[PDB]
Amino acid sequence: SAGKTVVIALGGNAMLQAKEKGDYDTQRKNVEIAASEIYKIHKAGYKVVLTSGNGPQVGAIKLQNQAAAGVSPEMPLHVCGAMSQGFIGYMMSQAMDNVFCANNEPANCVTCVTQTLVDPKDQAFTNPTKPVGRFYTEILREDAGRGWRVVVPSPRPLEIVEYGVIKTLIDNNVLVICTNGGGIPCKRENKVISGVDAVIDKDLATSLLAKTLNSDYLMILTDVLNACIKKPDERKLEEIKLSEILALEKDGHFGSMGPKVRAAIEFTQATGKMSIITSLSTAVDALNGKCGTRIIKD
Amino acid sequence: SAGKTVVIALGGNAMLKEKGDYDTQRKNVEIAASEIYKIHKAGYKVVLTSGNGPQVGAIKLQNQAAAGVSPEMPLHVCGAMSQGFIGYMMSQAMDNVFCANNEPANCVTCVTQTLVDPKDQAFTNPTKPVGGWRVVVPSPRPLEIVEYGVIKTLIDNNVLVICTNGGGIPCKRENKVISGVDAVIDKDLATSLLAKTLNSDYLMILTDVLNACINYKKPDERKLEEIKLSEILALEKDGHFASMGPKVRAAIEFTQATGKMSIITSLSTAVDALNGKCGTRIIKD
């Protein structure tokens, strides 16, 4: 119709916080919160593509697979990927509809299972850098600081396989959840896609997806708005130019806020378009130019 | 976009004595794919569904290792997981065959929720075997398809659509909140419901068995070819089917509610079934 299309990137912390159970209920509960915050964007008349993360979820599922002779064959990590999609996407769907219905907007919303393409010869296959699963001291389990997660390969996304449909599903004004966990990692090679055991960075695949669709906005929701430097002589970002943080990101100043910034930098670089990192709460607000790290065409 | 639209609900050997590791399934799907692709080059618009059982049963088994600092998940969520994995299987399958026929194009899987009646007798009588055999769960009757208006859309634009895998997350609605209920709906009944709602030109349920037969291994034997709606609700009302049972139930309700041909056919012969050179083709009058 007439709304500008926004691509939003919900955190995995936004369903299973570091210190929270991992129970279905527990998770669903937090997702009904988000649902309600995303709804405000739809209400305001924007198009929504909803994407999210996977940490908590893909990690849980593979732990289980690895308890692996309760008569039951162990599924590859890409498959677990397959599985988290069915999951989170089920949760996000059901909530995005509850909210709709709650509003007497009886309406329309799907979840597409996505594959993302990657280079098998990517370096992250011989270097598992990316946290997965849950927390606890003590293949390799790694620091992180807050508590010794598992790590998997994490190679670059290159092509959303399913973009054509998502695209279609937006042109027909459908609120689409897709690319959860940034897509089931696969590789083309010889006219046949097949799946590689990895987990792709939500913020890069959401970046890649944004440019692919040519969205009017890239919005990565967090729980922590902007980025700081806590010290006496601090400054955290609001509206800033693609001049200023191409530069400021290069001063090293960016653990968790890094690939975030990197992704927003990429989108905003290649489409002229504004990109936003905000706390989930203030989502709608940042679209009106009233807060958040909006990084701009410059 | 001139293609008539055909709603096909795949078997269990679409992914399968044999079990069950990932490579093993992938191939059996790869094989149904190539079959389903034939139909899409013939021109029909295709809506592809299937089953959970083995896949959802076994996802469910793994949650029963309920302690590996990882929390067990209700049936309906293993349900979602199934759709993730099965839909990811067919999804990739087709894409490859599309590429192979140099037809680079469009196919998705939508994760699908199905409304059921919280009061359905099957929530007390758990009679559909999942993972002599038989972890057997409740199997109630599918009322509405939640993602219907999107699917109907995704076909109006001729995208190949894969949904109602496992007949979709069983759910109940009440007080305008949808929510999951620990169960597993019959693939076939559900894919029928869907097609009739979508008002498809065709429902089709592919077994292994190329055609249904009354009284088995026994002529007096009659493998059924093309029959009238009169004749076989009548033949069903007299127990010639209680395994082929739901299959025959589903088709009957859809020719009934739409006045449209149904087919029951081995996957090997859908295309031919489409062109009236076998199957159980069950038509109105």
From TrEMBL, chain B:
GO molecular function: carbamate kinase activity
Assigned keywords, A-Z: Kinase, Transferase
Protein name: Carbamate kinase
Pfam families given in the database record: AA_kinase
Residues annotated as signal peptide: none
Source species: Giardia intestinalis (strain ATCC 50803 / WB clone C6) (Giardia lamblia)
Any one of the GO BP annotations: L-arginine deiminase pathway
Keyword Transferase: yes
Entry GO CC: cytosol
Family: Belongs to the carbamate kinase family.
